[PDB]
Amino acid sequence: GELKCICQELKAIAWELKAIAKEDKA
Amino acid sequence: GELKCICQELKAIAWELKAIAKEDKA
Amino acid sequence: GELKCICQELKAIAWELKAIAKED
Amino acid sequence: GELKCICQELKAIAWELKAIAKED
Amino acid sequence: GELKCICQELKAIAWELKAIAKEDKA
Amino acid sequence: GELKCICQELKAIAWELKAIAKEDKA
Numbered sequence: 001g002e003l004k005c006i007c008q009e010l011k012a013i014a015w016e017l018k019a020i021a022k023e024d025k026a
Numbered sequence: 027g028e029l030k031c032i033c034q035e036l037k038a039i040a041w042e043l044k045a046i047a048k049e050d051k052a
Numbered sequence: 053g054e055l056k057c058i059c060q061e062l063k064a065i066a067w068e069l070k071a072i073a074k075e076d
Numbered sequence: 077g078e079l080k081c082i083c084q085e086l087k088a089i090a091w092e093l094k095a096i097a098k099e100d
Numbered sequence: 101g102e103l104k105c106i107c108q109e110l111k112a113i114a115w116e117l118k119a120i121a122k123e124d125k126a
Numbered sequence: 127g128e129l130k131c132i133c134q135e136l137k138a139i140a141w142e143l144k145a146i147a148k149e150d151k152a
Contacts, residue, residue, distance in 0.1 A: 001029070002027075002029035002030050002032070002033050003029065003128035003129070003132070004128060004131075005033040006029070006032060006033050006036060006128075006132060007128060007131040007132050007135055009033060009036035009037050009039070009040050010036065010132060010135035010136060010138075010139065011135050011138075012037075012040040013036070013039060013040050013043060013135075013139055014135055014138040014139045014142060016040060016043035016044050016046075016047050017043065017047075017139060017142035017143060017146065018142050019047040020043070020046060020047045020050065020142070020146060021142050021145040021146050021149070023047070023050055023051065024050070024146055024149045024150070025145075025149050027055075028055035028056050028058070028059050029055065031056075031059040031062075032055070032058060032059050032062060035059065035062035035063055035065075035066050036062065038066040039062070039065060039066045039069055042066060042069035042070055042072075042073050043069065045073040046069070046072060046073050046076060049073065049076045050076070054077070054079035054080055054082075054083060055079070057079075057080075057083035058079070058082055058083050058086060061083055061086035061087050061089075061090055062086060064086075064087075064090040065086065065089055065090045065093060068090055068093035068094050068096075068097050069093065071097040072093065072096060072097045072100060075097070075100055076100065078101075078103035078104055078106070078107055079103070081104075081107040082103070082106060082107050082110060085107060085110035085111050085113070085114050086110065088110075088111075088114040088118075089110065089113060089114045089117060092114060092117035092118050092120070092121045093117065093121075095121040095124070096117070096120060096121050096124055099121070099124045099125065100124065101129075102129035102130055102132070102133050103129065105129075105130075105133035105136075106129070106132060106133050106136060109133060109136035109137050109139070109140050110136065112140040112144075113136065113139060113140050113143055116140065116143035116144050116146070116147045117143060117147075119147040119150075119151075120143070120146060120147050120150055123147075123150045123151055124150075
């Protein structure tokens with residue numbers, strides 16, 4: 001339900017921040 | 027209900043971070 | 053109650069992120 | 077309660093992002 | 101329990117953002 | 127279950143923000 005939805009969007013956020021982190025480093 | 031509001035806002039946040047992650051590149 | 057509180061602060065966060073993404 | 081705790085940390089998050097948005 | 105887990109991680113997120121905001125004066 | 131999934135993703139987000147905060151420190 002909505003809890004699975006919330007976990008899925010949090011995973012999305014984590015992966016966007018990893019992209020921001022690697023680029024920032026670069 | 028409120029759990030749906032929460033999921034929808036996390037989707038918005040994920041999308042804005044995608045924009046920030048892309049911007050820094052382009 | 054408390055769930056509505058959480059919803060409203062996530063709206064506030066999405067809104068600050070929108071300001072950040074625009075000015076960048 | 078843990079829910080109040082969660083809403084309070086989200087406000088603290090929105091606060092810092094407002095500082096990042098205003099600065100940038 | 102897991103709700104205490106979630107509050108603690110949000111505290112950790114708010115702390116890293118406070119660090120980013122403080123160094124952001126550049 | 128679902129709440130543990132949420133906590134785990136928040137840990138992942140906190141870790142990426144830590145990386146960002148430390149890069150920025152430089």
